[PDB]
Amino acid sequence: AMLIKPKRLQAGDIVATVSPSWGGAGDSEIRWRYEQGVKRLEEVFGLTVVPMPNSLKGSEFIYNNPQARAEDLMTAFQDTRVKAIIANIGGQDSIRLLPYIDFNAIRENPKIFMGYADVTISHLFCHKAGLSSFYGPAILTDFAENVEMDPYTVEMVNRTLFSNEMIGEIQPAPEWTSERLEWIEINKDTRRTMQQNNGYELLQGSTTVQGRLIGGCIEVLEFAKGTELWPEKKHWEDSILFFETSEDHPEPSYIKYWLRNYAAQGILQKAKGIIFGKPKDEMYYEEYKHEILQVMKEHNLEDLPILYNLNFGHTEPKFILPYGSMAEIDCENGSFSILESGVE
Amino acid sequence: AMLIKPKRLQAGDIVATVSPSWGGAGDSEIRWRYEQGVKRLEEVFGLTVVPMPNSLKGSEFIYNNPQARAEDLMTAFQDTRVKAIIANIGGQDSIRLLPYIDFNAIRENPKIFMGYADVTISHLFCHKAGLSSFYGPAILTDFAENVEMDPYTVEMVNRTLFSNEMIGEIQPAPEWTSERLEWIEINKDTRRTMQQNNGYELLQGSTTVQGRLIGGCIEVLEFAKGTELWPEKKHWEDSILFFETSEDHPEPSYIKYWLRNYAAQGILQKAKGIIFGKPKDEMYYEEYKHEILQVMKEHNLEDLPILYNLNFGHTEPKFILPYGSMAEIDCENGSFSILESGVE
Numbered sequence: 112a113m114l115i116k117p118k119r120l121q122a123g124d125i126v127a128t129v130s131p132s133w134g135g136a137g138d139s140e141i142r143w144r145y146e147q148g149v150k151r152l153e154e155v156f157g158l159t160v161v162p163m164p165n166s167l168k169g170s171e172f173i174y175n176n177p178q179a180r181a182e183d184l185m186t187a188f189q190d191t192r193v194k195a196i197i198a199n200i201g202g203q204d205s206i207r208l209l210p211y212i213d214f215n216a217i218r219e220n221p222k223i224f225m226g227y228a229d230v231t232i233s234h235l236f237c238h239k240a241g242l243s244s245f246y247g248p249a250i251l252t253d254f255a256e257n258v259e260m261d262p263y264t265v266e267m268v269n270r271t272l273f274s275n276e277m278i279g280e281i282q283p284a285p286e287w288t289s290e291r292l293e294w295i296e297i298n299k300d301t302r303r304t305m306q307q308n309n310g311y312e313l314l315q316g317s318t319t320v321q322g323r324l325i326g327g328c329i330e331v332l333e334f335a336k337g338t339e340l341w342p343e344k345k346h347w348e349d350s351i352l353f354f355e356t357s358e359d360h361p362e363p364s365y366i367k368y369w370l371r372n373y374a375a376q377g378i379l380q381k382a383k384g385i386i387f388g389k390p391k392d393e394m395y396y397e398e399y400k401h402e403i404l405q406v407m408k409e410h411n412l413e414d415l416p417i418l419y420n421l422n423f424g425h426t427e428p429k430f431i432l433p434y435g436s437m438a439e440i441d442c443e444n445g446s447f448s449i450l451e452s453g454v455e
Numbered sequence: 456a457m458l459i460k461p462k463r464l465q466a467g468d469i470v471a472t473v474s475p476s477w478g479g480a481g482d483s484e485i486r487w488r489y490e491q492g493v494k495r496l497e498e499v500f501g502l503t504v505v506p507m508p509n510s511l512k513g514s515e516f517i518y519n520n521p522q523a524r525a526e527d528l529m530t531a532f533q534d535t536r537v538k539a540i541i542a543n544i545g546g547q548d549s550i551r552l553l554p555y556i557d558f559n560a561i562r563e564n565p566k567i568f569m570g571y572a573d574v575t576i577s578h579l580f581c582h583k584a585g586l587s588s589f590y591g592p593a594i595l596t597d598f599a600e601n602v603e604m605d606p607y608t609v610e611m612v613n614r615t616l617f618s619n620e621m622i623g624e625i626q627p628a629p630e631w632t633s634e635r636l637e638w639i640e641i642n643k644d645t646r647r648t649m650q651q652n653n654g655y656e657l658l659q660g661s662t663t664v665q666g667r668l669i670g671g672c673i674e675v676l677e678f679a680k681g682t683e684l685w686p687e688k689k690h691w692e693d694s695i696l697f698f699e700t701s702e703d704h705p706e707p708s709y710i711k712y713w714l715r716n717y718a719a720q721g722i723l724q725k726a727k728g729i730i731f732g733k734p735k736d737e738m739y740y741e742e743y744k745h746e747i748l749q750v751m752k753e754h755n756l757e758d759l760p761i762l763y764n765l766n767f768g769h770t771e772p773k774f775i776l777p778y779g780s781m782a783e784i785d786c787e788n789g790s791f792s793i794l795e796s797g798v799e
């Protein structure tokens with residue numbers, strides 16, 4: 112282990128909400144959605160929520176003030192009352208925060224940080240500071256789910272952030288959705304239609320392997336390549352890579368190119384295994400498979416275990432991936448597990 | 456200066472053709488196109504052309520044998536009779552040659568190497584070896600133009616590779632084209648339709664600047680980010696960046712993302728200026744300008760000289776960009792110049 116595992120959460124703890132990417136949470140027509148997400152944090156998990164100063168000032172201000180976003184993060188980390196930090200939503204430009212990050216402030220204040228998509232960049236901030244962050248649900252997409260939170264997501268939050276015992280095997284969700292239901296309050300009493308889930312798919316591999324988790328949104332990780340934010344070499348040794356595709360539905364060819372680059376970096380050659388999240392709307396589901404298996408064939412990595420269609424990324428519900436945690440891919444059973452606690 | 460400048464070309468010299476990317480040149484229905492290109496090298500420039508052993512074995516073989524492609528390049532460089540090397544065509548997977556390149560062989564054998572698009576990777580082979588290469592025309596796309604080569608392209612070959620005098624100002628071409636005329640022999644007698652060219656556009660900047668050239672195909676450069684092929688930091692200081700978009704017409708959003716990454720690397724903050732090639736078919740011509748100016752605005756670089764719509768990239772005709780050569784953007788006149796010879 113080379114990342115600090117933060118302290119477990121419990122009822123009464125204060126959680127901070129932040130907008131390091133898109134600042135729509137503060138927009139007039141969206142605010143209701145944010146408040147809905149806060150409600151579940153307070154009622155289902157018994158937590159106290161506090162928005163950081165600049166977090167709800169709207170999308171226009173947020174976009175024009177990357178420094179203000181950084182200040183919000185630093186404030187949350189440097190406040191010892193804050194036991195956890197949760198992103199409101201992803202976006203596309205959180206990379207602009209890099210010049211304003213005091214990594215030492217993160218290093219000196221280990222605590223839970225969670226989010227996904229463009230929040231991958233913020234996870235890399237933590238990662239560089241030697242802090243294990245959590246690739247998981249955000250306020251507006253998961254906690255603010257209309258009518259009721261998904262029991263699957265709730266369970267995984269409990270198991271990951273409220274328990275210092277081994278997470279164990281991650282079962283596949285029974286249902287999933289990526290249906291677009293506009294975030295206007297007129298729809299708050301409307302449930303999203305669910306789709307039956309078929310489970311995980313083993314694309315290749317014939318062995319049981321263990322490695323430490325690293326990765327995120329495959330599109331956003333590209334933003335950090337070549338930068339000082341990219342993880343040091345040792346973080347890629349004996350790893351379990353995890354990738355998920357965003358809502359832009361990246362064309363299959365780009366997956367191929369991006370994976371080719373991971374081979375050019377020597378990353379795929381060091382991996383113990385790889386896991387892929389369900390594509391949003393299951394778009395390019397079969398096409399991505401082709402591109403992935405092709406790259407492995409190109410670099411003689413056809414024995415590398417790859418698990419597909421996992422419940423993380425841009426579909427609901429989702430489980431949580433702690434960065435740096437020991438994970439397992441059992442090819443014989445086609446199962447996936449996390450072999451330790453997410454928190455102390 | 457850090458890159459070695461190769462010796463000037465002249466009639467009687469031997470030129471090697473290579474397929475470091477797509478191996479179509481050897482394909483039955485394309486071979487004629489290769490031979491037509493060779494014909495111009497012989498008759499227009501008085502050069503002897505020799506294909507490398509694996510360069511014409513077809514697209515299937517070449518795709519499956521990246522090591523064979525590498526060996527072809529090493530052969531050409533290490534053969535002291537070969538005074539120049541020209542890529543047949545681009546592609547998308549020349550990054551796969553990386554583990555098979557002997558950079559020392561390139562170092563000990565300075566000579567002309569030219570091509571564009573996916574050949575950018577091969578330029579980075581030369582670059583890492585400290586050899587100045589030439590972002591310029593290829594066999595199948597330029598030297599094999601039906602009926603006759605564009606005088607503009609011929610002029611730039613002569614001014615860059617046959618003269619050891621200063622290249623000087625690069626005037627814009629009077630006409631341009633990117634019309635898809637199938638490379639089947641039945642079309643050899645058909646000219647491609649030309650479009651009037653309107654000249655360069657200054658997107659921003661108000662001061663004359665000078666710096667050394669570095670860049671290539673913006674999509675292909677992403678393939679090398681994070682790898683040991685990426686040029687060292689010193690090469691990016693006081694440089695003139697040059698980018699051009701490929702035939703796949705990359706969505707404007709990706710131009711923004713990619714340019715955001717250059718800022719995240721600190722490259723844009725080091726540049727003296729930037730030049731962009733005419734997009735293929737002028738697709739996203741206006742859209743790209745918006746994305747470029749947005750990124751400059753995000754990172755407070757609205758004074759950085761940016762010249763737009765130059766005659767290099769995936770349109771014909773072309774001029775040639777020698778890596779590492781001193782170049783100039785004159786904002787007063789909106790002109791572009793290369794302030795030294797391309798060859799010794």
Ligand SMILES: Nc1ncnc2c1ncn2[C@@H]1O[C@H](COP(=O)(O)O)[C@@H](O)[C@H]1O
Nearest residue numbers: 200201202228229252292293294357358
């Ligand atoms: N105004 C909106 N109404 C409903 N859903 C939205 C809205 N804006 C964004 N979303 C969804 O929220 C997701 C957030 O993804 P990300 O920004 O990657 O975290 C998007 O992919 C959309 O599916």
Ligand SMILES: Nc1ncnc2c1ncn2[C@@H]1O[C@H](COP(=O)(O)O)[C@@H](O)[C@H]1O
Nearest residue numbers: 544545546572573635636637638701702
């Ligand atoms: N069989 C073909 N017939 C006509 N044009 C082609 C053919 N194959 C490739 N091209 C063109 O050649 C260029 C290839 O780009 P690159 O591979 O980047 O050099 C593009 O402009 C293609 O449209």
